Each structure stands twice: as structure tokens, then as C-alpha cells.
Amino acid sequence: MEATLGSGNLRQAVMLPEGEDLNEWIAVNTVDFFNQINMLYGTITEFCTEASCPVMSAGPRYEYHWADGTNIKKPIKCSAPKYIDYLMTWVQDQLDDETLFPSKIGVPFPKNFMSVAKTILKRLFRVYAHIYHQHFDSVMQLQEEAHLNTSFKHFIFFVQEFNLIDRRELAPLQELIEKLGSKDR
Ligand SMILES: [Zn+2]
């Protein structure tokens, strides 16, 4: 596919820089994908409504109901816009949590960091899946497909590099994922 005009080599971009800490690298990248997705979803919010998306899905057979096991335990079957708002607000709350993503160098990453990072990442994946399945038309109208595709490719190379999401969670975009990159024959 076509990459954005300003993108670089994504396979190299996701590798852990020599001398850098793994937890910190995942933290920096996770913050970045949250921003990339926030940016992309923002461009199509007027096309993702209560009426266009009465439920959160990535194709009919993959429906998502929101729950975070703390504030909301009983899964909520809401519209995509509300589901994504719940989701992104939840991810942002984790990112702003000083005990999870330490703002001070004298504070180590918590023991459950990786687990929290993986949970964030698997959830962010769902926004890409909904966008591709329900709004690729609006993406094409804005002529921003390169941005969505490059961001998604970057995201997938990153999670594959560190095995951060299990294959099964990626089901709705597995075909696309298998097409990413290329066999050198
Ligand atoms: Zn939608």
C-alpha cells in the first residue's frame, strides 16, 4: 500500500533503541499510538454517530460492549461513539496515572506495567478495527487513507515486535495484517 509522504522505515522504527529500557520504550510507543488514533478518529467523528453506529463493532460478528472492571463492571452495549469515548477516556486516565506511567525518574515502572500496557494496546486496536470496517468510505473521501494505513502498519509492527496482543484479538483485521510489509520473495 501507499505510505504517507512523511513516514519512514516502520520496521526499524519499532525496534528497541540500543541502550533504552523496554518498559520505557513500550510506554513511549503506547502514548504515541493513543495520539495517532485520537488524531485519526477525530477526523471522522461527524460520520460516526448514534444513528450510523448503534453498537460498537468491527463487522457484524465482532461486537464490543464496554466495561473496565472498576467504574463499569456490567458490560455496556452502547453506540460506537460512546464506546470509543469510554475507551479513549479510560486509556488517557491510565497514561496520566503517575503510578503507572511515572513522571519522575526516581520512580520505577510498576510490576503490572506490561499487563496495563497490553490492555491499553488491545483496546486501542478496536478503534482501528471499527474505523476500517465502518468508516473507510469517509477516510477515502478525506483522501487520508495513507495516514490510516501507515498508522495501522506502524501499530501492528510495534505489537508484533514485542508480542503485545494475542492473534485472536486481532481477528477483525487479520487479513489486512497478513498483507502488511512484504515477502522478499
Ligand atoms: Zn462508527
From Swiss-Prot:
InterPro entries for this protein: MOB_kinase_act_fam, MOB_kinase_act_sf
GO BP of this protein: hippo signaling
Gene3D superfamilies linked: MOB kinase activator (1.20.140.30)
Entries under Pfam families matching the protein: Mob1_phocein (PF03637)
Annotated Gene Ontology cellular component terms: cytoplasm; cytosol; extracellular exosome; nucleus
Domain of life: Eukaryota
Alphabetically ordered keywords of this record: Acetylation, Metal-binding, Phosphoprotein, Zinc
Tissue: Adrenal gland, bone marrow, brain, placenta, prostate, salivary gland, skeletal muscle, testis, thymus, thyroid gland, heart, spinal cord, fetal brain and fetal liver.
Record's subunit section: Binds STK38 and STK38L. Interacts with LATS1 and LATS2. Forms a tripartite complex with STK38 and STK3/MST2.
Family: Belongs to the MOB1/phocein family.
Task of the protein: Activator of LATS1/2 in the Hippo signaling pathway which plays a pivotal role in organ size control and tumor suppression by restricting proliferation and promoting apoptosis. The core of this pathway is composed of a kinase cascade wherein STK3/MST2 and STK4/MST1, in complex with its regulatory protein SAV1, phosphorylates and activates LATS1/2 in complex with its regulatory protein MOB1, which in turn phosphorylates and inactivates YAP1 oncoprotein and WWTR1/TAZ.
Protein name per Swiss-Prot or TrEMBL: MOB kinase activator 1A
Organism: Homo sapiens
Gene: MOB1A
